[PDB]
Design a protein around this nucleic acid. Structure first.
Ligand SMILES: Nc1nc2c(ncn2[C@@H]2O[C@H](COP(=O)(O)OP(=O)(O)OP(=O)(O)O)[C@@H](O)[C@H]2O)c(=O)[nH]1
Ligand SMILES: [Mg+2]
Lengths: 661, 49, 47, 124, 360, 95, 27, 52
RNA sequence: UAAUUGGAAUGAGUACAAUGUAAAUACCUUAACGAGGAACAAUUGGAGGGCAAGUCUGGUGCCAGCAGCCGCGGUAAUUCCAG
């Protein structure tokens, strides 16, 4: 019972799986370019320089690795890469310690689904003594063991003698990330995703010049498809993270430009890459067919294959007498119904036993049973694909993972091309049918335990959900013991309120994660993740109910009967409420009974005890509040700077910048 | 370019929202309200419970 | 620096442990005080 | 005279009978209708046979105002001397001295039933 | 924008599909060449039903009434009623809720009134024994159709009750490559507000047809009378041939009105049933749209269903072209290698579908 | 080990009641589904549906004012981390 | 009408959950 | 534990051949899925039933 | 009971140095630094107590019971069971 698990489905292919993506992350100065430089130098014997963009390198007879130096500062890029990364070389300074970006990325990875995190600690050649060094190594290792599992091994890299790290350690990294098996996550095995090696805009100069350069250009984007079959017809939808939400106009499978030697070996066993081990383009160096022909009427299609409405239920039967003569002798349908001759009886009886009750008779645990059913299904898929002529396989399976693909959009905004730089990742994501609708989501969430200040109702929260980052206006509700949805005005400091907000939908039980400001100017020393949740249900209306108490005074007192002023102002006001409940502030129950007419708002009310004059009456009304409908998607890489996307400002901030209480 | 039109209307929505959000609250989003602080008949046109 | 160094709280990681005295640190000190307190009682009942 | 008090063997007896929504249940010796009302929910028309008009009066009092008030006939007298009408399954609790007559009377019916859930003494 | 369909042909199917996939559609030129163009009354009532079970959706109807613009919302459910207009029986509105029922937030408890028999549309033994077992194969556990009162044409006034209890996330992937062996024949034969010699005479005719084939034959006679029997006489039959091993069914039904010699009617339905059997493999010719749609919305996984080549007809081709217009799903028909007959395995890769409107 | 099959008493009004604290859990070795307690009712937010709870025996020495005959297990670790390390806010649940 | 329908929902749900915990344990 | 169940038996072939011999001798003194059993038994009951 | 403060004491740590050792590292020894919230920030468990202009349940009134991180405002602000 360390072995058993929730069963899940893999959906990585078996013939040519794509390259694994190896993000390399860490703070600004920590040496994450020397790492990628020396890893590639060990794995191809071919030193680079000026590394930018994804970079695919063959490592072995099969593994291909797609390195990606994540940018240092921008919390948007860390969110993107944490969604797609598949190994993380999380590299932390050794002399300094942890730094707050390492912690931030770690929590973003833990919420969306944690990739294989492997930590490496650099700047270890700055220590002056072995006792300081040795204790600090142990201490970072133990904190890192809290964040990731225990026994997770980190690597310690000394100096950068030649623009690159040692050989013993780098050889250990290469061995270890080239034996490693990856975990079947959830979000990645339903959605196709794609990491883009190169990028070209496809318009004439003529439309630019003759229409004044403004128009959203047609753009084609190349790269590797991970995840799930991206279907082989145009028009499917896509979210290009940090840009927007498009629909693909043409797709096409290229021949992939970094083949493993196994692949070339099998390709040269058709006709019967010694230095091109690295591919860094973004840096410089028949009735079944007769059904599906639209221009044919169905009737003519049937006629050719031989040689009407569906609104009626009963099908078309022949005419009565033709049946009556046809089905007199039922011999034709015979086989749908249940010293040597003895064996003939027993063969008849054997087949009958198999039919009749020979179903009730057909591993050790219950996890192995489920995985055996799953894997039986996966090979049924495989077999029924490999009878399909590769065009047809392409038509109904549709560009499985590992395919190199060119896809091309049109009407893509101008800024994406003018403000391009290869260091930021562009990451295509597929979309399920739910995640294109908009609605209100009811999630549950807590202040993130390290965030200093609690949140507030109706202060904007940039949250990431699915492939999307968008800024919304949540509204945090408790529930008054499963009766109503009282509208809280803060986040509880140590537990789970619910929240409701207006955004793109996503399926129930999906974890998300939300921040305050992402702008790299005004960040300071505080932790930045600010809420963690899952989305609980999905709809298009909720009603939230703020508690509002009407407060009034007494002015004439009987025994067990009072006269009330100052709560109301008219007569029909009271006449709307004859039968309400008023409770004394001191605490005895009561109600209101009747209205006085000549006094304008004064009336008479009953009670259980004779009221003291200073007591005050309050009625507990329930006003309804409702969510706003703000939605401000980040689009962080259309700007000129990309490290500051600013949206609504927090209420304290706009009071500070307007100098008011 | 369509991006600038989309953010000009975004800034419209944002500026209106901030101007609302710092501003003083409407009565029916408080507790302990009288007929003093509110205008009259505002419990006949509202449908609380 | 420009380096966003780490907090105290998210270094030593002791969330929600309750707040005890300054005397659960040092057992000798706690037994000392409890002896010289529960010796006062025996100086009233053995009067 | 004994009373099947257990309110959980009663439901199991009923739903093993596989009553269709177009059945005529004979239900011999109904008792105080601890069992009957389930059959009233699941059958089109019930024919209860009874000998104690005290029980018959109370049982027909049980169904009053209930929507199933019109889907229950009662035949009085000795069971082994009536003429049973057509009936389509049969459910029986009746005291055990008729356990051996009953069975053969069902086997020798004209148009016998299709299934019957009978309660008997263990050795029988 | 809008996927755009022509004509009035197979209305209910495109409305149901455009609710399942969640892509707004637009149907145009709806009998616009015809005398009074537009939707008939029952199509408008069907749109009222669809709008009643799906919170969030938006329907518009053109000025004349020959262009419907549908934008689906989520499915919700609830318990409600419906008053089926006089021209169409309740089966017309039961069947699309069979497609749409197991995928909602709350259960279905819908109460239909109206006529409960016709020549063209589905019966009440058709839906019970003809399309609940296909739904039960595809992972739907607890569904039922309580007949309360049975009407008849021309007046009716019956009422039935669709209760659907299990809410699956998505149907299972259903491999079936074998011709089932038929092991029994049951069937119902019913009549309202007539003397009971009719039912016996229908059973006489049917059993005289089926007195030569090697399985058991039984028929539940069902004679309503009085106050829940509706307002107008009529009689009808349904025969189900039932394969017990795997749980498959092939069935043929009809009703009958003033004038029909009921022995001929029973003989007719028995002949039609045999015809249906001889043109079938694992599904009858009319349970096939339900199974094909439940294959399409499965999970992303090849599902194989065997069909006889006689089932390949014009309704099939229309249905598959409508699926390829909404879903973009081709359907690979490979042939079998039994060289005694010309069956075809039909393999459909399911789209990736769930029930995104449940709650956790 | 076990899969959280569903929650029980998630719609039970009376807070901190025992039937509020109990989830219903399928074990992965047998296939048999049982019920399991959970300490500290706030920790029902941590288990969702299809988590891997690692159950331990409840083994209670005594029976209190409003307890339950029938809960026999208790949840120790939810998807790798341990409920004392989520409730004390040391770690947090790796999805 | 609201307060009633809440009472029958609450009674049924509570009783059924206790019945399931009576359905498991002496198996 | 002579005639145990070893983990993998194709890779222990000379061993199991030797054990087969040992068993042959030592018990020549006396020689001188149960779902397949349940399936065979039910089949034979069925055949007997149909002949009767 | 202490809740301010008065100087005396020392090593965890850092370190010239020597010793150690094959070579280092550490121990043992030692110049120079190194203690007031001595923030140079002991833990793991279980038992009680209170928390109302709050919620929820039941009833022979003002009650009881569950519970109470959910109240009228307010979160660079509340400086709260100093905590
Ligand atoms: N002494 C020492 N210097 C290092 C180490 N690692 C990196 N450096 C130096 O620090 C500088 C930063 O290294 P980069 O390769 O720029 O790493 P980076 O994280 O990409 O830095 P940015 O480009 O600013 O993101 C380089 O000039 C290295 O020579 C180390 O372990 N020890
Ligand atoms: Mg760099």
């Amino acid at each position: 019972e360390r072995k058993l698990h929730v069963p899940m489905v893999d959906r990585t292919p078996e013939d040519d799986p794509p390259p694994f993506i190896v993000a390399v992350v860490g703070p600004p100065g920590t040496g994450k370019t020397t790492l990628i430089r020396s890893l590639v130098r060990r794995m191809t014997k071919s030193t680079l320089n000026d590394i930018q963009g994804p970079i695919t390198v063959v490592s072995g007879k099969h593994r291909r690795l797609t390195f990606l130096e994540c940018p240092a500062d921008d919390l948007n890029a860390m969110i993107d890469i944490a969604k797609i990364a598949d190994l993380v070389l999380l590299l932390i300074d050794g002399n300094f310690g942890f730094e707050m970006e390492t912690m931030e990325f770690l929590n973003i990875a833990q919420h969306h689904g944690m990739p294989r995190v492997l930590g490496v600690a650099t700047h270890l050649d700055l220590f002056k003594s072995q006792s300081t060094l040795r204790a600090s190594k142990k201490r970072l290792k133990h904190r890192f063991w809290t964040e990731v599992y225990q026994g997770a091994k980190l690597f310690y890299l000394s100096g950068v003698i030649n623009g690159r790290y040692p050989d013993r350690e780098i050889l250990n990294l290469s061995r270890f990330i080239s034996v490693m098996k990856f975990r079947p996550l959830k979000w990645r095995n339903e959605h196709p995703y794609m990491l883009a090696d190169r990028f070209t805009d496809l318009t004439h100069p003529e439309l630019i010049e003759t229409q004044g350069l403004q128009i959203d250009r047609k753009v084609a984007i190349y790269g590797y498809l991970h995840g799930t079959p991206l279907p082989s017809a145009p028009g499917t939808r896509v979210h290009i993270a940090g840009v927007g939400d498009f629909s693909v106009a043409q797709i096409e499978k290229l021949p992939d430009p970094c083949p493993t030697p196994f692949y070339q070996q099998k390709l040269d066993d058709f006709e019967r890459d010694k230095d091109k081990l690295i591919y860094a383009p973004m840096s410089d160096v028949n009735i079944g067919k007769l059904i599906y022909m639209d221009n044919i009427s169905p009737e003519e299609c049937i006629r050719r294959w031989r040689g009407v409405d569906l609104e009626k239920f009963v099908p078309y039967f022949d005419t009565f007498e033709k049946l009556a003569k046809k089905w007199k002798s039922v011999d034709a349908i015979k086989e749908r119904f249940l010293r040597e001759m003895n064996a003939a009886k027993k063969e008849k009886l054997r087949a009958q036993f198999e039919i009749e009750e020979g179903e009730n008779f057909k591993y050790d645990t219950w996890y192995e049973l489920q995985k055996a059913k799953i894997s039986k299904q996966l090979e049924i898929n495989n077999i029924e694909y490999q009878e399909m002529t590769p065009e047809q396989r392409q038509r109904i399976e549709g560009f499985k993972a590992g395919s190199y693909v060119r896809i091309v959009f049109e009407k893509v905004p101008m800024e994406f091309v003018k403000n391009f730089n290869p260091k930021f990742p562009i990451v295509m994501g597929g979309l399920l049918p739910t995640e294109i609708k908009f609605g209100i989501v009811k999630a549950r969430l807590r202040r993130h335990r390290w965030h200093k200040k609690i949140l507030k109702t109706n202060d904007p929260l940039v949250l990431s959900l699915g492939w999307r980052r968008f800024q919304t206006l949540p509204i945090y509700t408790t529930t008054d013991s499963r009766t109503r949805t009282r509208m809280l005005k803060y986040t509880p400091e140590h537990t789970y309120c619910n929240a409701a907000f207006y955004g793109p939908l996503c399926s129930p039980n999906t974890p998300f994660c939300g921040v305050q400001i992402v702008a790299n100017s005004d960040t300071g020393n505080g932790f930045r993740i600010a809420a963690t949740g899952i989305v609980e249900e999905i709809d298009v209306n909720i009603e939230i109910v703020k508690k509002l108490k009407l407060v009034g005074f007494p002015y004439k007192i009987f025994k067990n009967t009072a006269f009330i002023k100052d709560m109301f102002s008219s007569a029909m006001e009271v006449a709307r409420f004859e039968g309400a409940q008023i409770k004394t502030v001191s605490g005895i129950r009561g109600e209101i009974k009747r209205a006085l007419s000549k006094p304008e708002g004064h009336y008479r009310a009953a009670f259980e005890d004779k009221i003291l004059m200073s007591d005050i009456v309050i009625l507990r009304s329930w006003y309804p509040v409702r969510v706003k409908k703000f939605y401000n998607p980040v689009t962080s890489l259309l700007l000129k700077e990309k490290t500051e996307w600013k949206g609504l400002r927090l209420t304290g901030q706009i009071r500070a910048a307007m100098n008011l209480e | 370019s369509s991006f600038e039109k989309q953010q000009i209307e975004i800034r419209k929505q944002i500026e209106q929202l901030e101007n609302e959000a710092v501003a003083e609250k409407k009565w029916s989003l408080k507790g302990e309200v009288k007929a003093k602080d509110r205008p009259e008949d505002a419990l006949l046109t509202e449908e609380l419970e | 620096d420009g380096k966003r160094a780490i907090n105290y709280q998210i270094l030593k990681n002791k969330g929600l442990t309750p707040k005890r005295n300054k005397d659960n640190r040092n057992s000798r000190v706690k037994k000392r005080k409890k002896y010289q307190k529960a010796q006062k009682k025996l100086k009233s009942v053995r009067a | 005279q004994h009373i099947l008090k257990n309110p959980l063997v009663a439901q199991g007896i009923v739903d093993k009978a596989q009553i269709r929504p177009s059945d005529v249940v004979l239900e011999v010796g109904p008792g105080t209708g601890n069992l009957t009302v389930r059959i009233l929910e699941q059958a089109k028309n019930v024919v209860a046979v009874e000998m104690d008009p005290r029980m018959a009066a109370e049982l027909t009092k049980r169904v009053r105002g209930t929507p199933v008030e019109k889907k229950l006939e009662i035949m009085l007298g000795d069971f082994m001397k009536t003429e049973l009408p057509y009936f389509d399954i049969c459910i029986s609790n009746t005291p055990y001295q008729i356990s051996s007559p009953l069975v053969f009377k069902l086997i020798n019916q004209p148009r016998p039933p299709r299934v019957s859930i009978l309660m008997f003494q263990r050795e029988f | 924008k809008y996927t755009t369909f022509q004509g009035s042909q197979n209305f209910r199917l495109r409305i149901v599909l455009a609710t399942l996939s969640g892509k707004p559609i637009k149907i145009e030129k709806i009998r616009s060449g015809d005398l009074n163009p537009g939707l008939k009354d029952y199509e408008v009532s069907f749109l009222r039903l669809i709008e009643s079970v799906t919170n969030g959706s938006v329907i518009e109807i053109s000025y004349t009434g020959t262009t419907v613009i549908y934008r689906p919302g989520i499915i919700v459910g609830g318990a409600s009623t419906h008053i089926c207009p006089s021209s169409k029986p309740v089966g017309y509105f039961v069947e699309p809720m069979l497609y749409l029922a197991p995928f909602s937030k709350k259960k279905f408890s819908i109460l239909f009134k109206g006529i409960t028999a016709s020549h063209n549309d589905a019966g009440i033994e058709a839906i019970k024994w003809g399309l609940m077992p296909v739904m039960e194969k595809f992972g739907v556990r607890e569904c039922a159709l309580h007949t309360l009162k049975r009407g008849s044409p021309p007046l009716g006034g019956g009422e039935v009750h669709l209760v659907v209890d299990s809410l699956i996330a998505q149907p299972i992937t259903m491999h079936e490559i074998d011709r089932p062996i038929i092991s029994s024949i049951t069937g119902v034969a019913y009549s309202t507000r007539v003397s009971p010699s009719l039912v016996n005479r229908m059973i006489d005719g049917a059993k005289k047809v089926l007195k030569n084939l090697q399985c058991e034959v039984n028929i539940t006679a069902d004679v309503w009378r009085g106050e829940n029997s509706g307002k107008s006489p009529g009689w009808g039959i349904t025969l189900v041939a039932q394969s017990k091993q795997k749980g498959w069914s092939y069935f043929a039904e009809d009703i009958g009105d003033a004038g029909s010699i009921p022995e001929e009617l029973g003989e007719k339905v028995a002949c039609q049933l045999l015809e249906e059997i001889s043109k079938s493999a694992a599904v009858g010719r009319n349970q096939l749209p339900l199974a094909i749609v439940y294959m399409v919305i499965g999970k992303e996984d090849i599902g194989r269903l065997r069909i006889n080549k006689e089932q390949i007809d014009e309704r099939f081709i229309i249905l598959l072209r409508d699926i390829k217009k909404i879903f973009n799903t081709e359907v690979f028909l490979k042939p079998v290698d039994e060289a005694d007959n010309e069956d075809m395995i039909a393999t459909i890769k399911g789209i990736g579908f769930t029930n995104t409107s449940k709650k956790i | 080990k076990g899969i959280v099959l569903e929650k029980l008493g998630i719609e039970s009004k009376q807070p901190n009641s025992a039937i509020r604290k109990c989830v219903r859990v399928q074990l992965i070795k047998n296939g048999k589904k049982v019920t399991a307690f959970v300490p500290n009712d706030g920790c029902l937010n941590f288990v969702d549906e299809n988590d891997e709870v690692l159950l331990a025996g409840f083994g209670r020495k005594g029976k209190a004012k409003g307890d339950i005959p029938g809960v026999r297990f208790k949840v120790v670790k939810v998807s790798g981390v341990s409920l004392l390390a989520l409730w004390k806010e040391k770690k947090e649940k790796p999805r | 009408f609201e307060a009633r329908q809440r009472i029958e929902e609450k009674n049924k749900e509570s009783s059924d959950y206790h019945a399931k915990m009576a359905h498991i344990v002496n198996t | 534990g002579t005639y145990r169940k070893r983990f993998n038996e194709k890779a222990r072939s000379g061993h199991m051949a030797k054990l087969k011999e040992l068993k042959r001798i030592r018990n020549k003194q006396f020689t001188r899925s149960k779902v397949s059993r349940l399936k065979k038994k039910r089949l034979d009951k069925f055949i007997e039933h149909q002949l009767k």
